[PDB]
Design a binder for this molecule. Structure first.
Ligand SMILES: *C/C=C/c1cc2ccc(N(CC)CC)cc2oc1=O
Length: 133
């Protein structure tokens, strides 16, 4: 399936700290962020995605169109400029954030009712799993 619509509640989180440290996120923010769960809300209409991940503290809020590159300021996260592009590799949704950091981006896919997220920066991979509400 290429349909990621839903409210996705966090089931699993592995190595979020390594990903954030590879982005050089300030220590106090990273130490608080690694403790906190969050919910991922995806509104998808064709190529058009609105995604938002909300925790009691931090924010993640990105809208994009599959196949359309966009210049992105990463704002609240690590305050960097990247050229972001989201495409399909089969049923895996792949994002590359071209810029200073190597191997920066993510992959999302659905495997037996659960949403998998792999966040990558440099040699660090964070894996998260969510269940659909
Ligand atoms: C494709 C989904 C990406 C994604 C990336 C994220 C980056 C940072 C954060 N937080 C917690 C709200 C700040 C440390 C969350 C987040 O969720 C995602 O789904």
């Amino acid at each position: 399936t290429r349909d990621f619509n839903g409210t996705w509640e966090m089931e699993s989180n592995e190595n979020f700290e390594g990903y954030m440290k590879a982005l050089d996120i300030d220590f106090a923010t990273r130490k608080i962020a690694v403790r906190l769960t969050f919910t991922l809300v995806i509104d998808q209409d064709g190529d058009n995605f609105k995604t938002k991940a909300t925790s009691t503290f931090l924010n993640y809020d990105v809208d994009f169109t599959v196949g359309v590159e966009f210049d992105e300021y990463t704002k609240s996260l690590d305050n960097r400029h990247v050229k972001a592009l989201v495409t399909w590799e089969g049923d895996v949704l792949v994002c590359v954030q071209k810029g200073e950091k190597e191997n920066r981006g993510w992959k999302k896919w659905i495997e037996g009712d659960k949403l998998y997220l792999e966040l990558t920066c440099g040699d660090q991979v964070c894996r998260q799993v969510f269940k659909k509400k």
